[PDB]
Design an enzyme around this catalytic site. Sequence first.
Site, PDB file in Angstrom:
ATOM      1  N   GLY A  18       0.894  -1.268  -0.226  1.00  0.00           N
ATOM      2  CA  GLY A  18      -0.083   0.205   0.015  1.00  0.00           C
ATOM      3  C   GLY A  18       0.904   1.430   0.050  1.00  0.00           C
ATOM      4  N   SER A  19       0.305   2.209   0.171  1.00  0.00           N
ATOM      5  CA  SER A  19       0.934   3.724   0.514  1.00  0.00           C
ATOM      6  C   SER A  19       1.923   3.489   1.527  1.00  0.00           C
ATOM      7  CB  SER A  19       0.017   4.592   0.670  1.00  0.00           C
ATOM      8  OG  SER A  19      -0.901   4.971  -0.581  1.00  0.00           O
ATOM      9  N   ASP A 132      -5.461  12.038   0.846  1.00  0.00           N
ATOM     10  CA  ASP A 132      -5.347  10.872  -0.379  1.00  0.00           C
ATOM     11  C   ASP A 132      -6.122   9.900  -0.378  1.00  0.00           C
ATOM     12  OD1 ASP A 132      -2.665  12.346  -1.103  1.00  0.00           O
ATOM     13  OD2 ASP A 132      -1.615  11.189   0.921  1.00  0.00           O
ATOM     14  N   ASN A 137      -8.402   3.266  -0.973  1.00  0.00           N
ATOM     15  CA  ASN A 137      -8.448   3.335   0.386  1.00  0.00           C
ATOM     16  C   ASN A 137      -9.749   2.881   0.998  1.00  0.00           C
ATOM     17  OD1 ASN A 137      -5.702   4.464   0.902  1.00  0.00           O
ATOM     18  ND2 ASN A 137      -6.571   6.566   0.289  1.00  0.00           N
ATOM     19  N   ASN A 328      36.248 -22.215   0.807  1.00  0.00           N
ATOM     20  CA  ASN A 328      37.119 -23.509   0.046  1.00  0.00           C
ATOM     21  C   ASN A 328      37.253 -23.141  -1.352  1.00  0.00           C
ATOM     22  OD1 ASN A 328      37.427 -25.951  -1.266  1.00  0.00           O
ATOM     23  ND2 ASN A 328      35.836 -27.220  -0.058  1.00  0.00           N
ATOM     24  N   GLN A 332      30.350 -24.470  -3.057  1.00  0.00           N
ATOM     25  CA  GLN A 332      29.463 -25.188  -1.889  1.00  0.00           C
ATOM     26  C   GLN A 332      29.195 -24.416  -0.694  1.00  0.00           C
ATOM     27  OE1 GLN A 332      29.202 -29.460  -3.576  1.00  0.00           O
ATOM     28  NE2 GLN A 332      28.244 -27.605  -3.893  1.00  0.00           N
ATOM     29  N   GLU A 378      22.643 -22.542  -7.632  1.00  0.00           N
ATOM     30  CA  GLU A 378      21.287 -23.227  -8.107  1.00  0.00           C
ATOM     31  C   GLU A 378      20.301 -22.621  -6.803  1.00  0.00           C
ATOM     32  OE1 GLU A 378      22.505 -23.789 -10.523  1.00  0.00           O
ATOM     33  OE2 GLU A 378      22.162 -26.101 -11.212  1.00  0.00           O
ATOM     34  N   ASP A 441       0.489  -6.315 -36.450  1.00  0.00           N
ATOM     35  CA  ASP A 441      -0.618  -5.639 -37.114  1.00  0.00           C
ATOM     36  C   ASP A 441      -1.309  -5.153 -36.226  1.00  0.00           C
ATOM     37  OD1 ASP A 441      -1.597  -7.980 -35.844  1.00  0.00           O
ATOM     38  OD2 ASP A 441      -2.043  -9.001 -37.704  1.00  0.00           O
ATOM     39  N   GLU A 443      -1.576  -5.336 -32.633  1.00  0.00           N
ATOM     40  CA  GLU A 443      -2.179  -6.065 -31.567  1.00  0.00           C
ATOM     41  C   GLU A 443      -1.017  -7.093 -31.105  1.00  0.00           C
ATOM     42  OE1 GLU A 443      -5.514  -8.396 -32.568  1.00  0.00           O
ATOM     43  OE2 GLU A 443      -4.469  -9.539 -33.922  1.00  0.00           O
TER      44      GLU A 443
HETATM   45  C1  LIG Z   1      -2.359   4.831  11.051  1.00  0.00           C
HETATM   46  C2  LIG Z   1      -2.899   3.587  10.444  1.00  0.00           C
HETATM   47  O1  LIG Z   1      -1.904   2.531  10.289  1.00  0.00           O
HETATM   48  C3  LIG Z   1      -2.210   1.596   9.370  1.00  0.00           C
HETATM   49  C4  LIG Z   1      -2.468   0.471  10.108  1.00  0.00           C
HETATM   50  C5  LIG Z   1      -2.942  -0.623   9.240  1.00  0.00           C
HETATM   51  C6  LIG Z   1      -3.104  -0.512   8.049  1.00  0.00           C
HETATM   52  C7  LIG Z   1      -3.341  -1.610   7.448  1.00  0.00           C
HETATM   53  C8  LIG Z   1      -3.804  -1.353   5.816  1.00  0.00           C
HETATM   54  C9  LIG Z   1      -4.107  -2.467   5.382  1.00  0.00           C
HETATM   55  N1  LIG Z   1      -3.909  -2.756   3.855  1.00  0.00           N
HETATM   56  N2  LIG Z   1      -4.322  -3.723   3.464  1.00  0.00           N
HETATM   57  C10 LIG Z   1      -4.108  -4.280   2.347  1.00  0.00           C
HETATM   58  C11 LIG Z   1      -3.506  -3.562   0.974  1.00  0.00           C
HETATM   59  C12 LIG Z   1      -3.673  -1.957   1.497  1.00  0.00           C
HETATM   60  C13 LIG Z   1      -3.490  -1.209   0.042  1.00  0.00           C
HETATM   61  N3  LIG Z   1      -4.211  -1.484  -1.100  1.00  0.00           N
HETATM   62  C14 LIG Z   1      -3.726  -0.737  -2.260  1.00  0.00           C
HETATM   63  C15 LIG Z   1      -3.765  -2.941  -1.396  1.00  0.00           C
HETATM   64  C16 LIG Z   1      -4.298  -3.945  -0.001  1.00  0.00           C
HETATM   65  C17 LIG Z   1      -4.893  -4.478   4.575  1.00  0.00           C
HETATM   66  N4  LIG Z   1      -5.624  -5.481   4.533  1.00  0.00           N
HETATM   67  C18 LIG Z   1      -6.167  -5.848   5.423  1.00  0.00           C
HETATM   68  N5  LIG Z   1      -6.469  -5.157   6.410  1.00  0.00           N
HETATM   69  C19 LIG Z   1      -5.720  -3.917   6.561  1.00  0.00           C
HETATM   70  N6  LIG Z   1      -5.762  -3.258   7.910  1.00  0.00           N
HETATM   71  C20 LIG Z   1      -4.775  -3.815   5.340  1.00  0.00           C
HETATM   72  C21 LIG Z   1      -3.758  -0.303   5.355  1.00  0.00           C
HETATM   73  C22 LIG Z   1      -3.250   0.762   6.184  1.00  0.00           C
HETATM   74  C23 LIG Z   1      -2.974   0.642   7.444  1.00  0.00           C
HETATM   75  C24 LIG Z   1      -2.681   1.781   8.195  1.00  0.00           C
END
Ligand SMILES: CCOc1ccc2cc(-c3nn(CC4CCN(C)CC4)c4ncnc(N)c34)ccc2c1
Length: 459
Positions: A18-19, A132, A137, A328, A332, A378, A441, A443
């Site tokens: 995520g962000s 945001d 979100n 060595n 390995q 490997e 062509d 695609e």
């Molecule tokens: C102050 C907030 O701190 C947090 C704590 C937990 C967080 C958890 C998530 C979160 N993120 N995600 C999954 C990704 C979140 C971003 N998406 C683009 C893809 C999925 C979660 N899935 C299940 N439960 C969750 N709580 C999450 C996102 C932001 C959060 C911020």
Amino acid sequence: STAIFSDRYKGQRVLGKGSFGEVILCKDKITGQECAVKVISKRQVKQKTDKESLLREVQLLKQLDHPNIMKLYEFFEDKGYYYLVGEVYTGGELFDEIISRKRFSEVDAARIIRQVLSGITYMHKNKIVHRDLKPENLLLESKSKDANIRIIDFGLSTHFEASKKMKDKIGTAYYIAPEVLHGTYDEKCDVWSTGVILYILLSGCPPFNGANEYDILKKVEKGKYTFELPQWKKVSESAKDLIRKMLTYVPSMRISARDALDHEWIQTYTKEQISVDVPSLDNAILNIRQFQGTQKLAQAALLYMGSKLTSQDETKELTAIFHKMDKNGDGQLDRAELIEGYKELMKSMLDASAVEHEVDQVLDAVDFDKNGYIEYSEFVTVAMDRKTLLSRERLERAFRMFDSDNSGKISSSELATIFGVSDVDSETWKNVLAEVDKNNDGEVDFDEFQQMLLKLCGN
Ligand SMILES: CCOc1ccc2cc(-c3nn(CC4CCN(C)CC4)c4ncnc(N)c34)ccc2c1
């Protein structure tokens, strides 16, 4: 005696990216409670505020409780990261749920937007801004049809600086308020973002659109949009009115979140019984499915290229680490040394326990096992193929999902749209195609597309 994240929680599996960083499904080692942990790498994500300010916000966030706001339980800090521990939700992103429906009405959109406004209203009362806000979100609590919405990331934008990598900002430009671009913003920016989301729910098209990030932002900054798409004829005047008020340019003139909750449209279409006139918005749902498939394929293409660049880096680094550990010179190494170099590579693997098990999955995967002396060469190939799996597999999945008519191919008009969204220059991607298939062509099949992506990341 400040506590330590990995003393209390064990990582189970990755939930997503995520962000600001990775989200990991974790488990309390005593109580068994499952939680979603956002792990923020201090090296990749610069702080905008000071530590005192971050700790006070965290302390406040932990005390807030609303049914539409993700619940934050715990906060930890070490040398290298920040850990935010929240409740885990299993319904996925809202839009991915919406596109699986065959029916979607103004009543469904009003139920949705009323939850979002209700969460935003509560947070603005506590002087927290999202900034945001976007479809990604909005999570659904569970996979049930009747599931509540939970807004994630409320308040993080104030303290952390967002990535400038395209792979991380896909589908951000559509929703940002114009005042945010110019620097002077307040809580009304969250009403604008919500307004953009509502426009999309009822039409399936962004009100501000364009072929690349910068064309979208030029449209946002101007502030002009319209309701002349054919599918707006099916939509109540009441809904359009709320949208105009949310998409008002000057923030002091834009409706508040709290007032938006009282708007006639929300009052009318959230009464569970009255279907005074309630058609299904068939065009909208199919536009949203096209929109979503486009965004998911562009995102998967950038992460594919990124994963391929990482695997070049890590392959060479791991080989040089193993080479130097090989006293060595025989090529390995034993298990503990493989673990040691892989840990040295270090800097989902939240403790030493995570590393040992990854190595063990690869030593099991080394086909058949002789114990003591392992061919470092490997192990490197298999450890790295493992790392790319999720991203190549996901690339094919996203290609198939974008190819809705099952034609097996994507047109050069479609490629223009995908590479515009991914922000790859036009002249650059055609030069690349010309070299993959000198006779094409207009695609490409999945293999040709894949070969294009490899050439676009220097392979
Ligand atoms: C102050 C907030 O701190 C947090 C704590 C937990 C967080 C958890 C998530 C979160 N993120 N995600 C999954 C990704 C979140 C971003 N998406 C683009 C893809 C999925 C979660 N899935 C299940 N439960 C969750 N709580 C999450 C996102 C932001 C959060 C911020």
